[PDB]
Design a protein around this ligand. Structure first.
Ligand SMILES: Nc1nonc1C(=O)N[C@@H]1CC[C@H](O)C1
Ligand SMILES: Nc1nonc1C(=O)N[C@@H]1CC[C@H](O)C1
Lengths: 240, 240
């Protein structure tokens, strides 16, 4: 299930971070994922290739200039053809979570608009953007890292790209060599070779860690009978 | 207030995305921000420079190999000297928000450990990591994008780096040229040159957008008298 992602960015070279390295770099090289960038600076006409503009109403800060950005977006939409969802990354957007990632991953084509400076004209959001998404409640210098984050997360859902959380829980602890590290030993159950006991231990650990660190995540879950039991056990041991 | 950030990563070249471009790239060039990377692959001793290892207990997936990663971390700590906070980026960590960013930005030195594969040995977290942080409740292919995200967010707090939210609200809409765009006009108040009316309009817009999109964010705020009034006005107009 190929995925095509168009990107509008003043700094297209930043995306080398995901297109040239690791799992996502392999996905691109194998044509499982295609990332195509358009730079508003290429759509300027003035001598100094101006890509920012002053906000009506004054105040400090600049906005992205409308014409170059708008033209870049239109060009990306033309290349994308029918059925591309246009996304603007910003703190005003829907909060991204794994459920949201799975939904976005259902799209065969995405166009990601990366804001810089104080952002983009509200009317462009109204006329060009299908959805607004945020990767988190913090403020960055640009939308590029959010876009790459989104790309990385959805890429994991593409068949062939890959060689807890899916039940809404934090991950269990992981152990590798050596058997003893600064006096700390690997839990014996992991050495037992008892697949069922290992499965239950990992699940119990996930339930316990979710409960201790992120109890609000549990309220949103319909635990299985097995999960209810193991969580009760973990809570009992914690209270022991 | 200089900031030094040590990074442990199998893909140090990804960090060119923030050290070579934009506001963060300028911060680095001007020595306001220093980013220094250590690669566990450089701390391997076997012919094929192995950086992953099999998890005790079996199951699919690999973990980062302990020895190369541990040695890389120790080297970064030695370079950092006293007072460096060591952070591991992972979904099991404290959820990052702007309040959390401000807290992290108080550190003069940070060391950021970027996990790959299924993660790192739990005992390394116990023995080497000061704090665990998450950039969001979604799953990525590596900790590098989270690390860069964290770096970008804290960099904004470094004096000289910069040329909604600080009151806990979403941003107001922004407008730039032209005055009319696809039939949509700039709100006349922004053209008035009345600084006080413009300030109040922007604040009212932020309150309204926070209320409509992220009402849970309001519950955590102690609104000023002015904010209470403007929010009431916005809600009244919405109900008109
Ligand atoms: N959080 C986020 N999720 O997506 N984007 C952001 C974000 O911080 N955007 C910044 C706002 C001003 C600057 O233009 C870029
Ligand atoms: N969310 C996050 N905030 O910090 N890090 C992550 C994250 O998804 N880490 C991945 C887990 C497995 C892989 O090793 C990298």
């Amino acid at each position: 299930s190929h995925m095509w992602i168009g990107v509008i960015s003043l700094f297209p070279e930043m995306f080398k971070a995901i297109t040239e390295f690791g799992v996502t770099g392999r996905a691109v090289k194998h044509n499982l994922l295609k990332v195509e960038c358009w730079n508003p600076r290429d759509f300027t006409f003035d001598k100094h290739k101006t890509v920012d503009d002053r906000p009506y109403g004054g105040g400090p800060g600049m906005l992205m200039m409308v014409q170059p950005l708008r033209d870049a977006i239109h060009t990306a939409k033309a290349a994308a053809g029918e059925g591309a969802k246009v996304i603007y990354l910003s703190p005003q957007g829907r909060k991204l979570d794994q459920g949201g990632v799975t939904e976005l991953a259902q799209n065969q084509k995405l166009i990601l608009v990366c804001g810089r400076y104080e952002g983009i004209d509200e009317r462009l959001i109204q006329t060009e953007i299908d959805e607004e998404w945020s990767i988190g409640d913090y403020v960055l210098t640009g939308g590029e890292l959010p876009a790459m984050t989104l790309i990385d997360a959805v890429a994991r859902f593409i068949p062939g790209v890959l060689g807890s959380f899916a039940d809404g829980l934090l991950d269990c602890p992981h152990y590798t060599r050596p058997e003893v590290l600064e006096g700390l030993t690997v839990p014996p159950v992991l050495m037992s070779g008892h697949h069922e006991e290992i499965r239950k231990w990992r699940l119990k650990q996930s339930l316990q860690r979710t409960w201790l660190r992120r109890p609000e995540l549990l309220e949103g879950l319909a635990l299985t009978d097995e999960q209810r039991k193991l969580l009760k056990e973990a809570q009992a041991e914690h209270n022991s």
